[PDB]
Design an enzyme around this catalytic site. Structure first.
Site, PDB file in Angstrom:
ATOM      1  N   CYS A 176     -19.871   0.980 -76.863  1.00 40.44           N
ATOM      2  CA  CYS A 176     -19.536   1.008 -75.434  1.00 40.44           C
ATOM      3  C   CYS A 176     -19.710  -0.484 -75.145  1.00 40.44           C
ATOM      4  O   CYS A 176     -19.593  -1.334 -76.053  1.00 40.44           O
ATOM      5  CB  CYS A 176     -20.472   1.922 -74.696  1.00 40.44           C
ATOM      6  N   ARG A 177     -19.991  -0.759 -73.881  1.00 37.37           N
ATOM      7  CA  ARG A 177     -20.211  -2.125 -73.387  1.00 37.37           C
ATOM      8  C   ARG A 177     -21.520  -2.806 -73.783  1.00 37.37           C
ATOM      9  O   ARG A 177     -21.521  -3.872 -74.436  1.00 37.37           O
ATOM     10  CB  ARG A 177     -20.186  -2.172 -71.845  1.00 37.37           C
ATOM     11  N   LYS A 178     -22.607  -2.165 -73.379  1.00 39.07           N
ATOM     12  CA  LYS A 178     -23.968  -2.636 -73.662  1.00 39.07           C
ATOM     13  C   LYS A 178     -24.888  -1.556 -74.232  1.00 39.07           C
ATOM     14  O   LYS A 178     -26.120  -1.581 -74.023  1.00 39.07           O
ATOM     15  CB  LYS A 178     -24.639  -3.171 -72.402  1.00 39.07           C
ATOM     16  N   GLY A 179     -24.260  -0.633 -74.945  1.00 40.69           N
ATOM     17  CA  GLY A 179     -24.951   0.489 -75.593  1.00 40.69           C
ATOM     18  C   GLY A 179     -25.929   1.272 -74.717  1.00 40.69           C
ATOM     19  O   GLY A 179     -27.075   1.558 -75.124  1.00 40.69           O
ATOM     20  N   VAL A 180     -25.443   1.604 -73.530  1.00 36.52           N
ATOM     21  CA  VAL A 180     -26.206   2.368 -72.535  1.00 36.52           C
ATOM     22  C   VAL A 180     -25.611   3.776 -72.488  1.00 36.52           C
ATOM     23  O   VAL A 180     -26.268   4.768 -72.869  1.00 36.52           O
ATOM     24  CB  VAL A 180     -26.136   1.671 -71.183  1.00 36.52           C
ATOM     25  N   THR A 181     -24.372   3.822 -72.021  1.00 35.34           N
ATOM     26  CA  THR A 181     -23.606   5.069 -71.900  1.00 35.34           C
ATOM     27  C   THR A 181     -23.295   5.796 -73.210  1.00 35.34           C
ATOM     28  O   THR A 181     -22.749   6.921 -73.210  1.00 35.34           O
ATOM     29  CB  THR A 181     -22.286   4.724 -71.185  1.00 35.34           C
ATOM     30  N   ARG A 215     -10.890   0.637 -70.269  1.00 39.10           N
ATOM     31  CA  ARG A 215     -11.691  -0.376 -70.967  1.00 39.10           C
ATOM     32  C   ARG A 215     -11.260  -0.279 -72.431  1.00 39.10           C
ATOM     33  O   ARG A 215     -10.684  -1.233 -72.999  1.00 39.10           O
ATOM     34  CB  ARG A 215     -13.200  -0.109 -70.802  1.00 39.10           C
ATOM     35  N   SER A 227     -22.976  -3.125 -78.725  1.00 39.41           N
ATOM     36  CA  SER A 227     -21.728  -2.553 -78.205  1.00 39.41           C
ATOM     37  C   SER A 227     -20.641  -3.609 -78.409  1.00 39.41           C
ATOM     38  O   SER A 227     -20.845  -4.616 -79.121  1.00 39.41           O
ATOM     39  CB  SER A 227     -21.881  -2.200 -76.741  1.00 39.41           C
TER      40      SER A 227
END
Length: 293
Positions: A247-252, A186, A274
Protein backbone atom coordinates in the site's frame (compact mmCIF):
# COMPACT_ATOMS: atom_id res chain seq x y z
CA UNK A 1 4.59 -22.80 12.92
CA UNK A 2 1.20 -21.61 14.16
CA UNK A 3 -2.01 -23.20 15.44
CA UNK A 4 -4.78 -21.43 17.35
CA UNK A 5 -5.99 -17.97 16.33
CA UNK A 6 -6.79 -15.36 18.98
CA UNK A 7 -9.92 -13.21 19.05
CA UNK A 8 -9.14 -10.21 16.85
CA UNK A 9 -12.51 -8.46 16.75
CA UNK A 10 -14.13 -6.95 19.84
CA UNK A 11 -17.54 -5.28 20.10
CA UNK A 12 -18.90 -2.03 21.54
CA UNK A 13 -20.83 -3.82 24.28
CA UNK A 14 -17.90 -6.00 25.36
CA UNK A 15 -15.43 -3.27 26.30
CA UNK A 16 -18.36 -1.10 27.37
CA UNK A 17 -19.43 -3.87 29.75
CA UNK A 18 -15.81 -4.47 30.74
CA UNK A 19 -15.62 -0.79 31.72
CA UNK A 20 -18.45 -0.61 34.25
CA UNK A 21 -16.82 -3.75 35.63
CA UNK A 22 -13.60 -1.77 36.03
CA UNK A 23 -11.74 -4.60 34.29
CA UNK A 24 -9.73 -1.87 32.57
CA UNK A 25 -6.28 -2.28 34.12
CA UNK A 26 -2.88 -4.00 34.06
CA UNK A 27 -5.11 -6.72 32.63
CA UNK A 28 -7.05 -5.19 29.73
CA UNK A 29 -5.91 -2.02 27.96
CA UNK A 30 -7.78 0.02 25.35
CA UNK A 31 -6.09 2.73 23.29
CA UNK A 32 -7.05 5.03 20.41
CA UNK A 33 -4.65 4.90 17.47
CA UNK A 34 -6.22 7.30 14.97
CA UNK A 35 -4.55 9.61 12.45
CA UNK A 36 -6.00 11.95 9.82
CA UNK A 37 -3.98 14.18 7.49
CA UNK A 38 -2.45 17.64 7.87
CA UNK A 39 -5.32 20.12 7.83
CA UNK A 40 -7.98 17.55 7.98
CA UNK A 41 -8.36 16.80 11.69
CA UNK A 42 -6.28 17.07 14.86
CA UNK A 43 -6.85 13.78 16.68
CA UNK A 44 -4.47 14.56 19.55
CA UNK A 45 -6.93 17.34 20.37
CA UNK A 46 -9.99 15.19 19.65
CA UNK A 47 -9.00 12.35 21.98
CA UNK A 48 -8.36 14.40 25.11
CA UNK A 49 -11.66 16.04 24.16
CA UNK A 50 -13.67 12.83 23.88
CA UNK A 51 -12.50 9.26 24.47
CA UNK A 52 -13.24 5.80 25.87
CA UNK A 53 -13.37 5.47 29.65
CA UNK A 54 -9.72 4.89 30.57
CA UNK A 55 -8.23 4.96 27.21
CA UNK A 56 -4.83 6.33 26.20
CA UNK A 57 -3.82 7.93 22.91
CA UNK A 58 -1.27 6.22 20.66
CA UNK A 59 0.95 8.68 18.78
CA UNK A 60 1.60 6.98 15.44
CA UNK A 61 4.22 9.71 15.00
CA UNK A 62 6.32 8.75 18.03
CA UNK A 63 5.89 4.98 17.88
CA UNK A 64 8.27 4.60 14.94
CA UNK A 65 11.91 4.92 13.87
CA UNK A 66 11.90 8.69 13.37
CA UNK A 67 15.27 8.01 11.75
CA UNK A 68 14.27 6.37 8.46
CA UNK A 69 14.00 8.67 5.25
CA UNK A 70 10.58 7.05 4.88
CA UNK A 71 7.04 7.31 6.24
CA UNK A 72 6.21 5.37 9.41
CA UNK A 73 8.26 2.28 10.29
CA UNK A 74 8.38 -0.32 13.05
CA UNK A 75 10.46 1.01 15.95
CA UNK A 76 13.40 -0.94 17.38
CA UNK A 77 12.71 -3.87 19.71
CA UNK A 78 13.81 -1.62 22.58
CA UNK A 79 11.85 1.36 21.25
CA UNK A 80 8.46 -0.35 21.06
CA UNK A 81 8.39 -1.98 24.50
CA UNK A 82 9.34 1.27 26.23
CA UNK A 83 6.36 2.98 24.60
CA UNK A 84 3.69 0.29 24.95
CA UNK A 85 5.01 -0.24 28.48
CA UNK A 86 5.28 3.54 28.82
CA UNK A 87 1.48 3.38 29.00
CA UNK A 88 1.21 0.54 31.52
CA UNK A 89 1.07 -2.39 29.10
CA UNK A 90 2.65 -5.72 29.96
CA UNK A 91 3.04 -8.83 27.81
CA UNK A 92 -0.06 -10.28 29.46
CA UNK A 93 -2.55 -7.47 28.85
CA UNK A 94 -5.03 -7.74 25.99
CA UNK A 95 -4.87 -4.72 23.68
CA UNK A 96 -7.92 -3.09 22.09
CA UNK A 97 -6.87 -0.37 19.65
CA UNK A 98 -8.80 1.61 17.04
CA UNK A 99 -9.26 4.76 14.96
CA UNK A 100 -12.28 7.07 14.86
CA UNK A 101 -12.50 7.70 11.07
CA UNK A 102 -15.94 7.53 9.46
CA UNK A 103 -14.94 4.19 7.92
CA UNK A 104 -14.34 2.65 11.35
CA UNK A 105 -10.96 1.17 10.46
CA UNK A 106 -7.90 2.53 8.66
CA UNK A 107 -5.02 3.17 11.05
CA UNK A 108 -6.21 0.68 13.67
CA UNK A 109 -4.96 -2.39 11.81
CA UNK A 110 -1.72 -0.47 11.27
CA UNK A 111 -1.17 -0.68 15.03
CA UNK A 112 -2.92 -4.00 15.61
CA UNK A 113 -0.45 -6.11 13.64
CA UNK A 114 2.35 -3.84 14.86
CA UNK A 115 1.80 -5.49 18.24
CA UNK A 116 1.54 -8.77 16.34
CA UNK A 117 5.01 -8.40 14.82
CA UNK A 118 6.56 -8.04 18.28
CA UNK A 119 5.12 -11.45 19.14
CA UNK A 120 2.09 -10.50 21.24
CA UNK A 121 -0.96 -12.78 21.24
CA UNK A 122 -3.80 -10.92 22.95
CA UNK A 123 -4.51 -7.98 20.63
CA UNK A 124 -7.91 -7.51 18.99
CA UNK A 125 -9.54 -4.67 17.06
CA UNK A 126 -12.87 -2.96 17.72
CA UNK A 127 -15.64 -3.78 15.24
CA UNK A 128 -17.59 -0.54 14.83
CA UNK A 129 -14.97 1.99 15.93
CA UNK A 130 -15.63 5.16 17.93
CA UNK A 131 -18.05 5.90 15.09
CA UNK A 132 -20.55 3.31 16.31
CA UNK A 133 -19.33 3.74 19.88
CA UNK A 134 -20.78 7.25 19.92
CA UNK A 135 -23.63 6.16 17.65
CA UNK A 136 -24.42 3.19 19.89
CA UNK A 137 -24.13 6.09 22.34
CA UNK A 138 -21.74 4.71 24.96
CA UNK A 139 -20.09 6.63 27.80
CA UNK A 140 -17.08 8.81 27.00
CA UNK A 141 -14.64 11.06 28.85
CA UNK A 142 -12.34 14.10 28.79
CA UNK A 143 -10.23 12.79 31.67
CA UNK A 144 -6.49 12.07 31.66
CA UNK A 145 -5.50 8.41 31.91
CA UNK A 146 -2.19 7.90 33.71
CA UNK A 147 -1.72 4.13 33.98
CA UNK A 148 1.07 2.69 36.13
CA UNK A 149 3.84 2.13 33.58
CA UNK A 150 5.17 -1.41 33.20
CA UNK A 151 7.63 -3.60 31.30
CA UNK A 152 6.75 -4.92 27.84
CA UNK A 153 9.23 -7.44 26.45
CA UNK A 154 9.35 -7.29 22.65
CA UNK A 155 10.54 -9.98 20.24
CA UNK A 156 10.32 -9.05 16.56
CA UNK A 157 8.95 -11.84 14.38
CA UNK A 158 10.40 -12.17 10.88
CA UNK A 159 7.32 -13.88 9.46
CA UNK A 160 4.85 -10.99 9.50
CA UNK A 161 7.47 -8.75 7.90
CA UNK A 162 9.15 -8.94 4.50
CA UNK A 163 11.54 -6.16 3.48
CA UNK A 164 12.43 -4.62 0.12
CA UNK A 165 15.16 -7.18 -0.54
CA UNK A 166 12.80 -10.14 -0.17
CA UNK A 167 10.02 -8.35 -2.05
CA UNK A 168 12.55 -7.89 -4.85
CA UNK A 169 13.73 -11.51 -4.69
CA UNK A 170 10.04 -12.39 -5.03
CA UNK A 171 9.42 -10.40 -8.21
CA UNK A 172 11.73 -12.97 -9.81
CA UNK A 173 10.93 -15.83 -7.44
CA UNK A 174 7.21 -15.49 -8.17
CA UNK A 175 6.28 -17.42 -5.02
CA UNK A 176 4.71 -14.76 -2.81
CA UNK A 177 1.25 -13.33 -3.51
CA UNK A 178 1.39 -9.53 -3.72
CA UNK A 179 -1.60 -7.49 -2.56
CA UNK A 180 -1.99 -3.71 -2.35
CA UNK A 181 -4.72 -1.74 -0.58
CA UNK A 182 -3.50 1.51 -2.12
CA UNK A 183 -6.82 1.63 -3.96
CA UNK A 184 -7.55 1.43 -7.69
CA UNK A 185 -6.93 5.05 -8.72
CA UNK A 186 -3.67 4.91 -6.77
CA UNK A 187 -2.93 1.31 -7.75
CA UNK A 188 -3.97 1.98 -11.35
CA UNK A 189 -1.79 5.09 -11.49
CA UNK A 190 -4.64 7.46 -12.32
CA UNK A 191 -4.68 9.33 -9.01
CA UNK A 192 -1.74 11.19 -7.48
CA UNK A 193 -0.28 10.64 -4.01
CA UNK A 194 -1.44 13.30 -1.55
CA UNK A 195 1.33 14.93 0.48
CA UNK A 196 4.20 14.30 -1.94
CA UNK A 197 6.65 16.07 -4.25
CA UNK A 198 7.84 14.28 -7.39
CA UNK A 199 6.19 11.16 -5.99
CA UNK A 200 4.64 8.99 -8.70
CA UNK A 201 1.41 7.00 -8.47
CA UNK A 202 1.31 3.39 -9.68
CA UNK A 203 1.98 -0.24 -8.78
CA UNK A 204 4.32 -3.22 -8.47
CA UNK A 205 4.31 -5.81 -11.25
CA UNK A 206 2.20 -8.61 -9.78
CA UNK A 207 0.20 -6.16 -7.68
CA UNK A 208 -3.53 -6.91 -7.55
CA UNK A 209 -5.97 -4.29 -6.28
CA UNK A 210 -7.73 -5.04 -3.00
CA UNK A 211 -8.70 -1.61 -1.67
CA UNK A 212 -9.12 -1.66 2.18
CA UNK A 213 -12.47 0.11 1.83
CA UNK A 214 -14.08 -2.94 0.22
CA UNK A 215 -13.25 -4.90 3.37
CA UNK A 216 -15.53 -2.71 5.47
CA UNK A 217 -19.23 -1.86 5.24
CA UNK A 218 -20.94 1.53 4.98
CA UNK A 219 -22.17 0.93 8.53
CA UNK A 220 -18.47 1.00 9.39
CA UNK A 221 -18.58 -2.63 10.52
CA UNK A 222 -16.25 -5.30 9.15
CA UNK A 223 -17.53 -7.70 6.49
CA UNK A 224 -17.99 -11.33 7.53
CA UNK A 225 -15.79 -14.42 7.22
CA UNK A 226 -17.94 -15.55 4.29
CA UNK A 227 -17.66 -12.43 2.13
CA UNK A 228 -14.00 -11.90 3.01
CA UNK A 229 -13.12 -15.33 1.63
CA UNK A 230 -15.06 -14.64 -1.57
CA UNK A 231 -13.64 -11.24 -2.49
CA UNK A 232 -10.15 -12.72 -2.18
CA UNK A 233 -10.88 -15.71 -4.42
CA UNK A 234 -13.04 -13.48 -6.62
CA UNK A 235 -9.70 -11.85 -7.43
CA UNK A 236 -7.84 -15.10 -8.05
CA UNK A 237 -6.07 -14.48 -4.74
CA UNK A 238 -5.22 -17.65 -2.81
CA UNK A 239 -5.11 -17.38 0.98
CA UNK A 240 -3.73 -20.93 1.01
CA UNK A 241 -0.21 -20.10 -0.17
CA UNK A 242 2.17 -17.51 1.28
CA UNK A 243 1.01 -13.90 0.95
CA UNK A 244 2.52 -10.42 1.19
CA UNK A 245 0.95 -6.96 1.03
CA UNK A 246 1.79 -3.35 0.20
CA UNK A 247 0.00 0.00 0.00
CA UNK A 248 1.33 3.51 0.62
CA UNK A 249 2.86 3.34 4.09
CA UNK A 250 1.90 -0.21 5.10
CA UNK A 251 -1.02 0.86 7.28
CA UNK A 252 -4.13 -0.16 5.34
CA UNK A 253 -2.36 -3.41 4.45
CA UNK A 254 -2.84 -4.97 7.89
CA UNK A 255 -6.51 -4.65 6.96
CA UNK A 256 -6.00 -7.55 4.56
CA UNK A 257 -4.56 -9.65 7.39
CA UNK A 258 -7.38 -8.97 9.86
CA UNK A 259 -9.17 -10.00 6.66
CA UNK A 260 -7.04 -13.09 6.06
CA UNK A 261 -6.48 -13.43 9.81
CA UNK A 262 -10.23 -13.95 10.22
CA UNK A 263 -10.54 -16.34 7.28
CA UNK A 264 -7.92 -18.41 9.09
CA UNK A 265 -4.42 -17.26 8.15
CA UNK A 266 -2.32 -15.23 10.59
CA UNK A 267 0.55 -16.15 8.26
CA UNK A 268 0.36 -13.07 6.03
CA UNK A 269 3.30 -10.70 6.45
CA UNK A 270 3.79 -7.12 5.26
CA UNK A 271 6.24 -5.08 3.19
CA UNK A 272 6.15 -2.31 5.79
CA UNK A 273 7.58 0.47 3.62
CA UNK A 274 4.93 -0.04 0.94
CA UNK A 275 5.09 1.58 -2.50
CA UNK A 276 6.91 4.54 -0.96
CA UNK A 277 10.21 2.76 -0.33
CA UNK A 278 9.89 0.85 -3.61
CA UNK A 279 9.43 3.85 -5.90
CA UNK A 280 12.45 5.52 -4.30
CA UNK A 281 14.67 2.54 -3.52
CA UNK A 282 13.91 0.57 -6.69
CA UNK A 283 14.48 0.89 -10.43
CA UNK A 284 11.49 2.33 -12.29
CA UNK A 285 11.25 -0.75 -14.51
CA UNK A 286 9.77 -2.76 -11.64
CA UNK A 287 6.68 -0.66 -10.93
CA UNK A 288 4.00 0.30 -13.45
CA UNK A 289 1.31 2.93 -14.00
CA UNK A 290 -0.30 4.54 -17.05
CA UNK A 291 -0.01 8.32 -16.80
CA UNK A 292 3.57 8.61 -18.06
CA UNK A 293 6.10 5.83 -17.54
Amino acid sequence: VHQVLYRALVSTKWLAESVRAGKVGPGLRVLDASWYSPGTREARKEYLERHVPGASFFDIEECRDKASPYEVMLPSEAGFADYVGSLGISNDTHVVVYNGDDLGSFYAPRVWWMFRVFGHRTVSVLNGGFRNWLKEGHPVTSEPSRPEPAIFKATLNRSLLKTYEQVLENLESKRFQLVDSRAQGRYLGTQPEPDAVGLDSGHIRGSVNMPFMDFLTENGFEKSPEELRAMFEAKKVDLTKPLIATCRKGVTACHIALAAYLCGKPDVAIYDGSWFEWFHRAPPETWVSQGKG
